[PDB]
């Protein structure tokens, strides 16, 4: 993103605060407004906010040149804050799940983007795909949740459940349709673009580089240079921890199931020696390779009048 | 009414389908999340529901009231009772309460705790599901969308505003004042439990105009008052549901009119044992708001708040029928 981009993006977030908390509207609550606005300050804005950033990318990489104008990438943005409000509400549920913020301020911060949406865009022609894209996108990251919630029972990870499918399918509905489909989904709406087969290819492709996003994410939180990887302790289903169970003699297997999970320093040191046994790496950088050629081949393929500079942009900041 | 509760409850089995049983490679989970809202949404008493089809059937012209238009706004009551249920399983989180209506609170029971967060957000959520199914080729369409979506905000500004009341689990007797109060109960309650029903019905025949909705609304705010209020009396003064607002430390109307009438030393006994868990405690601020008269203060209040809210009725002018303020004004007085 270039410093044009970034620093036009960012100077929309003070007008979306003020938006909020009903400023030239005299309001009957001023001390809970105030705080509303300290709650959206203090975890809205401060990231690399690269969902936002990827709305606006998204829509100038899809709209006719000539349309492209300084208040329709405004609106671009804007729906890009939309996508980061949604963001910072499930950034809270993860901060209250693991321990100033209030419970009912994750479901606050999620109702306020559609706010933003009725005061920006109720008078255009894609406001009711929009709405209806962020009500479905909620209840499958809600899916999501869940699914990756059912890995898990009385404090310890169920190891049975730990199969590539699932964790697939966690990935998709947990992740993939609000972090990738939904900027690209927002872009080509802002567009006018409504055909569900172009709506279709952009998915298929997207739900791709999602789930190599998250491989290689699974896989640096155990083999990257130190945050610090926590995802063992935690008992998460990793992609590392499901090729693990996939490649286990009987003994490994007992290994996974004595120490995935534990609070122990100790036990995280077993199992990172076992997924170093079972070649783990190796096996990450063959399906790195592998995926990387994959999605080229389809992003090349792309077809129904899609752009390929968008998706290639996309996979590259992944990648890298 | 038999035939208008049978009709209502009929739908509940159709709405589950709906959001569960129409994600077919996750069958896992659409099984557990036909369970929470089996859980959470249709047991004991659907007044907000029902009050949505009642409000409906006042509102339309008599020639437009079909089965299916009826079956219409039966859909809308369950979209408030969708919306109630994730409410009402959050505050509980919140509140760290035992019982709801006597069954278990929903983030108690087995391997849920803190996930009772995500199933909040996902039973609000599931309501524009619903909404999308059955109303997105109708002109109400949008308006409600925006309806649900602004109480939604509205409510949660009342319930932040509600825990400004309190601090590290102590009650802060400085901010229960009548004015903020007031405010808790109009955004925390009213909003979803008076104006919504009311708002949705009139959507459902086609009154868009502002300024009947706003007439609605001054109505609604006042008996929406009048209902938390009795509401609060008869927590600490009904004959035993076992009230436990004081346990709690709840910004109640009691605790409120007790702080407006305490002399200094009646004061002291609030900030030493209002918010307290010992039963001793409890049964002190019970003995003060006997003392400082508080149940001939709420009999006053009664009968004064019926009488304004019986005239403002008859001054209410536009389209909108009397008869709908006067019955929902009738099943909350009982009279
Ligand atoms: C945004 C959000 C989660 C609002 C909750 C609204 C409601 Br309604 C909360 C219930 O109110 P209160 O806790 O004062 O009494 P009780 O639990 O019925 O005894
Ligand atoms: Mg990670
Ligand atoms: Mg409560
Ligand atoms: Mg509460
Ligand atoms: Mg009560
Ligand atoms: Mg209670």
Known sequence: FSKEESREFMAI??????????????????????????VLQYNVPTGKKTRGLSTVIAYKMLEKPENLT?????????????????????????????????????????????????????????????????????????????????????????????????????????????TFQLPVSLGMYLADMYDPEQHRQAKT????????????????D??????????????????????????????????????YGRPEPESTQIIKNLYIELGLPATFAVYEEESFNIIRTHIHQISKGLPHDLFFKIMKKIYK
Not at 13 to 38: M, N, Q, W, Y
Not at 119 to 133: A, D, T, W
Not at 205 to 214: H, N, Y
């Open 13 to 38: 977030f003070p007008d979306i605060v003020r938006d909020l908390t009903d400023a030239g509207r005299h309001t009957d609550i001023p001390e809970v407004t105030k705080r509303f606005a300290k």
């Open 205 to 220: 492709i997207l739900m791709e580089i999602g789930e190599f996003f998250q491989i290689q994410d699974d896989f640096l």
């Open 222 to 259: 155990a083999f990257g240079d130190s945050k610090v990887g926590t995802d063992i302790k935690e008992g998460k289903c990793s992609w590392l921890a499901v090729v693990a169970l996939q490649r286990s003699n009987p003994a490994q297997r007992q290994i996974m199931e004595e120490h």
């Open 70 to 178: 300084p208040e329709n990438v405004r609106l671009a943005g804007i729906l890009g804050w939309c996508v980061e409000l949604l963001q910072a509400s499930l950034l809270i549920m993860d901060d209250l799940m693991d321990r100033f913020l209030a419970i009912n301020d994750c479901l606050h911060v999620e109702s306020s983007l559609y706010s933003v949406l009725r005061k920006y865009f109720s008078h255009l022609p894609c406001y009711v795909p929009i709405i209806e894209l962020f009500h479905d996108v909620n209840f499958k990251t809600n899916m999501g949740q869940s699914l990756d919630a059912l890995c898990m029972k009385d404090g310890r990870p169920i190891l049975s459940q730990f199969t590539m499918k699932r964790y697939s399918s966690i990935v998709k509905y947990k992740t993939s349709y609000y």
